[PDB]
Design a protein around this ligand. Sequence first.
Ligand SMILES: [Cu+2]
Ligand SMILES: [Cu+2]
Ligand SMILES: [Zn+2]
Ligand SMILES: [Zn+2]
Lengths: 153, 153
Amino acid sequence: ATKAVCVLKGDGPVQGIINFEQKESNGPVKVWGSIKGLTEGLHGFHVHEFGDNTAGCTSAGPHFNPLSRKHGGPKDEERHVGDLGNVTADKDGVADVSIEDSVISLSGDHCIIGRTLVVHEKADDLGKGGNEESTKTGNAGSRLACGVIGIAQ
Amino acid sequence: ATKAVCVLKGDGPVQGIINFEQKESNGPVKVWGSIKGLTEGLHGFHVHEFGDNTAGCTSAGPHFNPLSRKHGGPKDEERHVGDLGNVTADKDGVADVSIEDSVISLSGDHCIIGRTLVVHEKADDLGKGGNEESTKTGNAGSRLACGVIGIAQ
Ligand SMILES: [Cu+2]
Ligand SMILES: [Cu+2]
Ligand SMILES: [Zn+2]
Ligand SMILES: [Zn+2]
């Protein structure tokens, strides 16, 4: 099995820790952890291409998309590898994250180690927003916090 | 060429950006950038095992050491893969780093993407300190700043 972890930080109050676990090659990756400081409600949650934080969350680039597809929800065939949808923050601003995805990977072609996880200002519209931006980012807006995905013990 | 980048931060004023570039498969990796906020003189500079910053630089673990060897300098036959020796800060506290190394790699068994780069409190004695600690860490002391190594554009 392979394990990874990500510490999310930004310019505001949003911070979190997200874990990744993959038991087998090409198997599902469990993504779980907790993010605090969020507004109540849905927040876009994606793996962006670069593990580059030199200029903050902005230098992580766009969504991880080695297949050159359009943006969608995690359950869509047409989606970016990094499209993990939304996470939900409760009334106290805490998002308990628990997702399983088989499009991302911790090894191989869809590997996300060394890339950046980002949690967003707004909900990801899953490509259903009717504008050009919807099929790029889901209109999820600004990057509240991010971190580089690292190898875990 | 494969490229990586690491933004170093810690609890104090030490901050920097270090770039990695490997033009050829299994070839030399250029490591360069700048670190500021350091006291003048030599500071240990290593790739540590885990890209885990949940407990600060402490959770990065020990030096990356897939071959189970003792600590040395980068030019030593006996060294950890993560042993990049020292960087030197000038009177203004700035270290302009430029190192070329062929033991680390940005792919394969010795891949360092997703691991942690650390800059230390003291000089790395390169394994010549005459005690057990020298053969583990080079006596470089505290971890002043660190960051996870990520894929760069
Ligand atoms: Cu995003
Ligand atoms: Cu070290
Ligand atoms: Zn997307
Ligand atoms: Zn070492």
